[PDB]
C-alpha cells in the first residue's frame, strides 16, 4: 500500500479528501493534521510515502506556505508531496516547481484528480492539471529595475526617484516601463497592487 | 494654552517655510521642529514633546527606511504621535496604502495652504482627515470602470483553474462571450497576460 498523510486546517475538507481516497483499495491514510506543528512532530513517527497538504494552515513554529513545503522536502526527501491549492497562483506554483515536488492539485477538481495524482506518483510521473501546466510552461528584472519599483512601491514619484538614484527622468521612466512589461502590468495602480505580492 | 506642538519634515527648505507659514495663522499651533532628512527627524523626536508630525512621504535618509516603510517605523516607535502624511503623489494605490497604516491624515502637498489647516482642525475635532482632493481619488477605486458581476464570476472561475471551455459550460454562455468577458476584465484591471492576471488575483 501507499501510506498517505493529509493536512488541511478545515476538518470537513479533511473528511472530504479521505472519502475521495477510500475508493482506492491500495491507499492507506496514516495521518490527518489541521496545523503544521502537529504535522511536523508526527512526520518522524509515520511511515508515509505521500503527503497531501494545503498551502494555508496555522502553526507559527514552522509556518505554512512555500517555506513549510521547503522545510518538509529538505528534511523528508523520501516523501512525495501533492500540494493542494484553491487558486492558480503562478508565483507559488513556480516556487513549488523549483522545489521539485511531485504534484499540484486544484481544490475544485480534487475528488476527480486526487486519485489521478496518486496513480501518477505511483508510476514515477508528476501531476499537474492543464490549467496549471499551461502556465508553468510560459525575462527577470535587472537590479536597476528592481530598485526603481521598490522606491515606486514606497510612494516615490518618478522625479523623486531620478534625484535619489541620480539618473535622468527619461531613464527612470524607461526602466520602470521596461519592468512593468516584464511583470505584465499596464498601469501604476495595477503595478502597486501587484507588488503587494 | 493647550497648544498643538507640531514637527514639520520636508527635504525642500522653502516648502518647509511655506508649510510653517501656512500654520502661523492657527494660533493654537506651535512649530517645535523642522527637518530635511528622516534620520535627524527620528533622532530628535523623543526630545521635542510633539503631538503631530507633518511629513513628506519621500525624503532622504536610508537608515530608518523610505516612504511607507519610514511611516511604518515611526508609527511603531512613536504610537502617541499623530501623523499627517504630506505627498505630491496623487496615485490612489499610494494614497490607499498610506491610509492602511492607520495614520491620522493624508494631504496633497499641492493643496497644503488650504488643506493642512483643515487637517489640524479635524485632528482637534477628534476626526481623521482625507480632504476632498484625496477622497475623490480613493473613490475612483482597482479602477473607476469597475468589473461587471459577469466579468467577476468569469475571473473567479478562471482563478480556480477552470479553462475557458469549462467556464463556458458552467456559466452557460458561448466560448466567444467568455473570452470577451475575460479580455474586457483584464483591460479594466490593467494586466496583459494570464500569469500577471493570476498573480494579481492572489494579492486581491
Curated annotation (Swiss-Prot), chain A:
Molecular function GO terms recorded: DNA binding
Spans through the membrane: none
Domain HTH luxR-type: 139-197
The keyword Transcription appears for this protein: yes
SUPFAM superfamilies for the chain: C-terminal effector domain of the bipartite response regulators, CheY-like
Gene Ontology biological process terms in this record: phosphorelay signal transduction system; regulation of DNA-templated transcription
Alphabetical list of PROSITE patterns matching this protein: HTH_LUXR_1, HTH_LUXR_2, RESPONSE_REGULATORY
Keywords: DNA-binding, Phosphoprotein, Transcription, Transcription regulation, Two-component regulatory system
Pfam name, any one: Response_reg
DNA-binding region listed in the record: 158-177
Chain positions with 4-aspartylphosphate modification: 54
Family: Belongs to the RcsB family.
Cross-referenced HAMAP family: RcsB
Protein name according to UniProt: Transcriptional regulatory protein RcsB
